[PDB]
Amino acid sequence: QRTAVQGSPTMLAAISKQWVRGAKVEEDRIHPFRKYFEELQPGDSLLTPRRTMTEADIVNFA
Amino acid sequence: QRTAVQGSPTMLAAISKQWVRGAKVEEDRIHPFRKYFEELQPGDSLLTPRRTMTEADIVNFA
């Protein structure tokens, strides 16, 4: 049965057992690529440090 | 008073409240550059990932 489940993305994430777009995140102080498969949860997030794009970046990549 | 304290480096580290050369280390799960000053201890170690030195490395650095 194809059911169109509505609701908040933090609810659709827990219904779908996935992470969708605007769900709550689980930032837990260590890196997601350090976790094994069984301890990765859908929602394990990571806010990376920034990087300023410059003209030298464009030149070196081109 | 000057005292030449002998012993193992893991003992001289705890006597001098420093880390010396061959003491036991407190390798934990997170990065020592993430800790503040009051939660750094002398002995907070980090085994970094490797980097293979190649001829291209020598050329680009020269």
Side-chain angles (χ1 to χ4, degrees):
Chain A
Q1 176 63 38
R2 184 176 292 113
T3 298
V5 177
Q6 293 176 355
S8 64
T10 184
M11 191 67 71
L12 297 173
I15 291 166
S16 64
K17 285 185 180 180
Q18 295 181 1
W19 182 81
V20 192
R21 178 61 67 193
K24 65 181 179 292
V25 293
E26 203 274 331
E27 296 177 354
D28 56 355
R29 193 182 176 183
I30 62 102
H31 199 82
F33 289 172
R34 296 180 184 272
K35 298 183 179 72
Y36 287 92
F37 182 80
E38 289 84 3
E39 55 187 358
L40 282 172
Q41 295 295 321
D44 287 334
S45 181
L46 177 76
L47 189 61
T48 65
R50 296 184 182 94
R51 180 174 179 177
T52 303
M53 297 302 172
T54 184
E55 188 177 3
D57 287 326
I58 298 173
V59 169
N60 288 120
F61 189 74
Chain B
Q1 177 61 39
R2 185 177 290 110
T3 300
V5 179
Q6 292 179 355
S8 65
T10 186
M11 193 66 72
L12 297 174
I15 288 167
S16 64
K17 285 186 178 180
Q18 292 181 357
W19 184 78
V20 184
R21 177 61 68 193
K24 67 181 181 292
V25 296
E26 199 273 327
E27 287 178 349
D28 58 350
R29 194 175 64 246
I30 57 100
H31 194 196
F33 283 177
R34 295 181 185 271
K35 300 182 180 70
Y36 287 93
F37 181 79
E38 288 84 2
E39 57 186 0
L40 280 171
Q41 298 295 320
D44 289 332
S45 181
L46 178 72
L47 185 62
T48 67
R50 298 180 182 90
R51 180 176 179 180
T52 304
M53 297 302 173
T54 186
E55 189 178 4
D57 283 326
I58 297 172
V59 170
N60 289 119
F61 187 74

